[PDB]
């Protein structure tokens, strides 16, 4: 009777009916199903038995400074749980929760006039109004709360929560193959619901493919005329032998007119998840070409009413079943082998190869040397791979040998092993196997990607899945954005199957945030059938009239409660509790955004909270420019160097759906340039408006940061907006903080889409140089801080590389090809030194401030 309400949950959760899984009637998906059930039942179980401290590190991850993971004068506001009453106490940054938590107790037990029997160790700090915790043994300066406060000059609300307190939530909770030499076959006997063009022929070329590499020559049909339904019943003869085909092996159709002209395209596994090679008849629910794709999915077309059919034919080869060989006998065939034993000479060459694409006889080299590649240079697995030729079953035997028995790579090189061009499955699981060392906060900073890597995904359980989800359940904030990233994918019909089956199996896993979620889901339920109203009133009636009609919208019982009191889709962290109906607005543009505000009473001033739900575009663009710019940020702040960033949140949660954080007390660079009359920045020049409007929101001494916060922001930005190539900067884009820090907003166009040049704006430069023509000094120090940026991103090259790499599954039209990926390799120069990169940025920042120079001179 709870299972039927849980199911019901969960379908409406991933806007999937689960009676859909059934009705497919696939083993693999029923299997999976269980399987994966279980795995999370498991998980679920193990967390439902954690310590009050092990709780906390779930519900509660905790939230550190980038110089921190891997003395100064403080006020600090504590209070207790069940109190009104609060203390404000003068703590040092160097001082770890405890100290506070002992002063804390102290201060109670006087006011309160008795003898306390509680220890400091029995408590937490949540951070008021917030998922947030302060436990460990850290200095509070490490807590990223707690730093944000000092840079922000704010005092940190913190109250004091017991163990018994964190357990009640806790509690509340509570849920033989290489015998066979002839070469393969495949009968491709008609296709099904075809259009085209009269007055041309059609062709069916089919390709065998491992990953991106061919493990053959490509063998086309007959020229078939233009049919809806056309019939061969030809012979397609690869030039591979059955033994010679690999376990990860993918046969890829194109159907195409020519007089060229793509129809669709479709490919399969030849091996079934339970290793047999399949045989019988198969018919390829094609998917709409704009010859052949390799990367595209494996699994047909859903709909299967508009597709375009094409039936195959997998001939019988031996009179049983034919099972991939298992690792036992695979590791017996790559075991015996003749050693590398060659000259120092070609062994200098050898490690130059290494260490440095590759002509012929170098791969060579490389394959007659894999031992010593293992034993003297293992981070150069992926090249050695790539040498091997997976279309011969030995070498691969060979190969997996070296695998087997190969060192634990660092997390940088176990993330270049998901990419396609590593297909073989015992490659992915060593790489999952180098990966499990992930720290849970870098997990979370290649989440995007590694979910990507699911599209990439040959079966439905696999190793990423399987330990995503492990992860997830051992994580709440990694839990709720693993949901987002497949949740917002569910329009898409070739991934919806899988997603939804991840989100069912993690539902399992967690009843309670299932809930929470489903809470969520029906606030952004509320907000697109708000947006849409929005959208037809602002055409009919002016803006104070729509801005009204939707406020009085916002005020039924309906909206009221489904869009309170909730967790923040942007960050868990986050409690969105009673919305600022009068508050809200919508921006003018296109798509018209709705700006939703929050506040509460717990949070405070720090609990005044907004967001932006836009319907219309697409966010994953925004999504990957602005966790790179995060990581950037990152990556400098590991490095000492804090340019002050300014990356909000953005998620998309639905189809073009999605939400963007409001950082309140912005405003746009072109709303200040606007130089009203009767304001605190109103200028005699319009190069003055900034540092005029800065002085206004930074008066006397505080001037003097807030230039420098500017600086920093730009120093950040210019290098940001030039490595990425993020090009169409107007004066709207850019917007600027009452502090000082300066940020940009919607990502339109990243790497170059014609090759964005290094940029820089007189305007900030006259900000920059403190209201002075010519500053020398002050300027100087902010190429100074380019320069030092630039050359951090630079050391980190591979890792925005394999990111970048890994991204190209989402699809994204700016982001697909080579060339793309040739932006940053021009960018953060990695073909020159140090010194010749450094050389070449200086040359493409002085063009800029040469460029900068149509303003001085005007
Ligand atoms: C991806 O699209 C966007 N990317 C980013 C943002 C965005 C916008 C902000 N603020 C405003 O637009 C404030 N306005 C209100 C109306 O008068 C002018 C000033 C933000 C401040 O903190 C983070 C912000 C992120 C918006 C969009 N969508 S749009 C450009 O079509 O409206």
Redesign the pocket.
């Known amino acids: 009777r709870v299972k039927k309400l849980i199911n019901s949950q969960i379908s409406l959760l991933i806007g999937k009916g689960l009676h859909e899984f059934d009705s497919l009637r696939d083993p693999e998906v029923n299997d999976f199903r269980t399987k994966m059930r279980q795995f999370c039942e498991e998980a679920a179980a193990h967390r439902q038995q954690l310590g009050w401290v092990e709780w906390l590190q779930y519900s509660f991850p905790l939230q550190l400074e980038p110089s921190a993971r891997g003395n100064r004068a403080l006020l600090v506001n504590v209070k207790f749980e069940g109190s009104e009453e609060s203390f404000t106490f003068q703590v040092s940054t160097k001082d770890m929760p405890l100290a506070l938590m002992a002063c804390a107790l102290r201060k109670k037990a006087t006011v309160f006039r008795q003898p306390l029997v509680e220890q400091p160790e029995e408590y937490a700090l949540q951070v008021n109004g917030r998922h947030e915790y302060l436990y460990g043994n850290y200095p509070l300066c490490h807590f990223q709360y707690i730093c944000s406060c000092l840079h922000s000059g704010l005092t940190p609300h913190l109250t004091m929560v017991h163990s018994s307190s964190i357990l009640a939530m806790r509690d509340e909770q509570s849920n033989s193959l290489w015998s066979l030499e002839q070469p393969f076959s495949i009968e491709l006997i008609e296709g099904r619901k075809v259009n085209a063009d009269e007055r041309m022929k059609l062709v069916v070329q089919a390709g065998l493919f491992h990953g991106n590499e061919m493990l053959c020559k490509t063998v086309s049909s007959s020229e078939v005329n233009v049919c809806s339904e056309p019939v061969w019943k030809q012979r397609l003869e690869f030039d591979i032998s059955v033994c010679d085909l690999p376990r990860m092996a993918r046969l890829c159709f194109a159907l195409y007119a020519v007089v060229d002209c793509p129809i669709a395209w479709a490919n399969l596994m030849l091996f079934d998840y339970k290793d047999q090679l399949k045989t019988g008849e198969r018919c390829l629910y094609m998917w709409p070409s704009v010859l052949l794709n390799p990367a595209g999915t494996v699994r047909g077309n859903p709909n299967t009413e508009s597709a375009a059919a094409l039936v195959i034919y997998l001939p019988e080869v031996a009179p049983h079943p034919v099972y991939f060989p298992a690792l036992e006998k695979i590791l017996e065939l790559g075991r015996h082998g003749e050693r590398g034993r060659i000259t120092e000479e070609e062994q200098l060459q050898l490690r130059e190869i290494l260490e440095r694409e590759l002509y012929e006889h170098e791969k060579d080299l490389v394959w007659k040397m894999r031992h010593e590649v293992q034993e003297h240079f293992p981070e150069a697995l992926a090249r050695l791979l790539l040498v091997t030729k997976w279309n011969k079953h030995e070498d691969v035997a060979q190969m997996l040998y070296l695998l087997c028995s190969w060192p634990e790579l660092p997390v940088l090189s176990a993330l270049e092993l998901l990419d396609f061009s590593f297909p073989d499955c015992y490659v992915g699981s060593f790489a999952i196997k180098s990966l499990r060392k992930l720290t849970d906060d870098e997990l979370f900073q290649y989440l995007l990607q590694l979910v990507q890597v699911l599209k990439y995904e040959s079966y439905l359980d696999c190793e990423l899945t399987k330990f995503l989800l492990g992860r997830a359940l051992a994580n709440r904030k990694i839990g709720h954005f693993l949901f987002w990233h497949l949740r917002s994918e569910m329009h898409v019909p070739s991934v919806a199957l899988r997603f939804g089956l991840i989100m069912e199996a993690y539902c399992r896993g967690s009843t309670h945030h299932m809930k929470v979620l489903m809470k969520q889901g029906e606030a952004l339920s509320k907000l697109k059938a708000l947006n849409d109203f929005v959208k037809v009133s602002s055409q009919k009636t002016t803006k104070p009239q729509t801005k009204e009609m939707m406020h009085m919208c916002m005020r039924q019982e309906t909206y009221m409660e489904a869009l309170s009191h909730l967790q923040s889709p942007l960050d868990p962290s986050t409690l969105l509790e009673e919305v600022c109906v009068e508050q809200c607005?919508f921006?003018?543009?296109?798509?018209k955004?709705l700006?939703i505000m929050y506040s509460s009473e717990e949070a405070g001033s720090a609990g005044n909270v907004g967001i932006?739900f836009?319907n219309g575009?697409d966010?994953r663009q925004?999504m990957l420019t602005l966790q790179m710019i995060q990581l950037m940020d990152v990556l400098w702040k590991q490095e000492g160097l804090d340019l002050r960033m300014t990356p909000?949140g953005?998620l998309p949660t639905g189809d073009r759906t999605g939400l963007?954080?409001?950082?309140?007390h912005?405003?746009?660079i072109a709303?200040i340039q606007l130089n009203k009359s009767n304001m605190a920045a109103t200028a005699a020049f319009n190069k003055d408006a900034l540092l005029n409007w800065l002085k206004s929101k930074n008066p006397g001494e505080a001037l003097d940061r807030a230039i420098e916060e500017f600086t920093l922001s730009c120093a950040g930005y210019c290098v940001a907006t030039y490595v990425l190539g993020i090009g169409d900067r107007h004066s709207?884009?850019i917007?600027i903080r009452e502090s000082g820090q300066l940020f940009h907003?919607?990502?339109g166009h990243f790497l170059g889409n014609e090759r964005v040049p290094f940029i820089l704006t007189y305007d900030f430069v006259h900000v920059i140089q403190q209201g002075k023509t010519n500053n020398s000094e002050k300027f100087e120090r902010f190429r100074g801080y380019c320069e030092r940026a630039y050359t951090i991103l630079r050391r980190h090259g591979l890792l925005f590389l394999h990111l970048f790499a890994l991204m190209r599954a989402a699809g994204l039209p700016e982001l697909s090809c080579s060339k793309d990926i040739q932006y940053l390799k021009d960018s953060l120069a990695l073909g020159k030194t140090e010194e010749e990169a450094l050389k070449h940025f200086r040359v493409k920042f002085n063009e800029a401030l040469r460029e900068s120079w149509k303003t001085k001179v005007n």
């Open positions: 607005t921006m003018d543009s296109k798509m955004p700006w932006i836009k575009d966010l925004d909000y953005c963007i954080e409001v950082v309140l912005s405003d746009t709303n709207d884009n917007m907003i919607d990502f």
